[PDB]
Design an enzyme around this catalytic site. Sequence first.
Site, PDB file in Angstrom:
ATOM      1  N   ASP A 175     -25.325  27.885  -6.564  1.00  0.00           N
ATOM      2  CA  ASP A 175     -25.293  27.171  -5.251  1.00  0.00           C
ATOM      3  C   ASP A 175     -26.634  26.378  -4.947  1.00  0.00           C
ATOM      4  OD1 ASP A 175     -22.636  27.327  -4.201  1.00  0.00           O
ATOM      5  OD2 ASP A 175     -23.122  29.323  -3.093  1.00  0.00           O
ATOM      6  N   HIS A 203     -21.632  26.187   0.791  1.00  0.00           N
ATOM      7  CA  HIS A 203     -21.489  27.489   0.340  1.00  0.00           C
ATOM      8  C   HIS A 203     -20.337  28.132   1.048  1.00  0.00           C
ATOM      9  CE1 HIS A 203     -22.972  31.673  -0.744  1.00  0.00           C
ATOM     10  NE2 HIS A 203     -22.163  31.891   0.209  1.00  0.00           N
ATOM     11  N   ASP A 230     -30.359  32.874  -8.526  1.00  0.00           N
ATOM     12  CA  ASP A 230     -30.669  32.596  -7.179  1.00  0.00           C
ATOM     13  C   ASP A 230     -32.226  32.399  -7.154  1.00  0.00           C
ATOM     14  OD1 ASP A 230     -28.164  32.713  -6.106  1.00  0.00           O
ATOM     15  OD2 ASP A 230     -28.268  34.743  -5.155  1.00  0.00           O
TER      16      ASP A 230
END
Length: 302
Positions: free
Chosen positions: A30, A79, A280
């Site tokens: 993301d 998201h 991430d």
Amino acid sequence: DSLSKSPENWMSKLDDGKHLTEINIPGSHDSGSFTLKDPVKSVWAKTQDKDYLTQMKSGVRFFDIRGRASADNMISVHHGMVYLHHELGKFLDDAKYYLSAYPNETIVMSMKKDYDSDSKVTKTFEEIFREYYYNNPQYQNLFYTGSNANPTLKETKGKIVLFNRMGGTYIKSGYGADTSGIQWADNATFETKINNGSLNLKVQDEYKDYYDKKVEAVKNLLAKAKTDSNKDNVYVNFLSVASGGSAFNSTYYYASYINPEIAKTIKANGKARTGWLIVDYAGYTWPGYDDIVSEIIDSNKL
Ligand SMILES: C[N+](C)(C)CCO
Ligand SMILES: C[N+](C)(C)CCO
Ligand SMILES: [Cl-]
């Protein structure tokens, strides 16, 4: 000097006859969430803190873009329900700018619909991406448009290669670019053939795992890639994991343990195939702990 010392142009140092599937690529999960500043919502919704150009200069080459059609000619970056404050043109503009400056890198861009379209929208998310981005004259020359289902670095460098999560598409170039698309299993490790059986995609995307099971799942697919020299197999291994909510551990919390654990593992494997590892907080470092983006880059043989 090792490749990770020059993360802005690390692909330029590799043999461009390699298929992209054979390159060990760091990605960001993301990618566009660096815009979020709300600290309550950021616990679960935010997964990066560097902008797209900074991620690129830090060596990230696979970008996970998930979106929502906000108009018949616009995809907004999301998201899930959470809007990420920008539309897809901003990513493409930054990618175009970077690939012009560093023309021997390639970017792989995953495209997925993450939330229902705005009520005014009349076209499918795939129609919108195809007609207003992929075939937009503005992005002429930006996308890989070749017909090889397993493209090399030479024929993709300077361009974005679509990794299609949209479902069936009429786009004919990139991973999953056919009218079946990619059959993706929810919260799972899975394998599935893509590009009319030309490739065997092997994914670990157990995004709701707790910590120990998530590390187990990442290392299990990392171990499979290490012994697999087949260029027609493509590995996508998501290190990222969901928060259970604002009162629970943040995505950053988990990244802070997982990234260094997996980075330690890769480094102890030396120069072994890892596949494409999606993380991430790409480029986020902790003094005393191995950096996952750097270790994926250095795992590539020269
Ligand atoms: C983050 N720890 C490794 C400390 C525990 C797992 O939840
Ligand atoms: C202390 N950190 C969370 C930064 C690394 C743990 O392994
Ligand atoms: Cl749709």
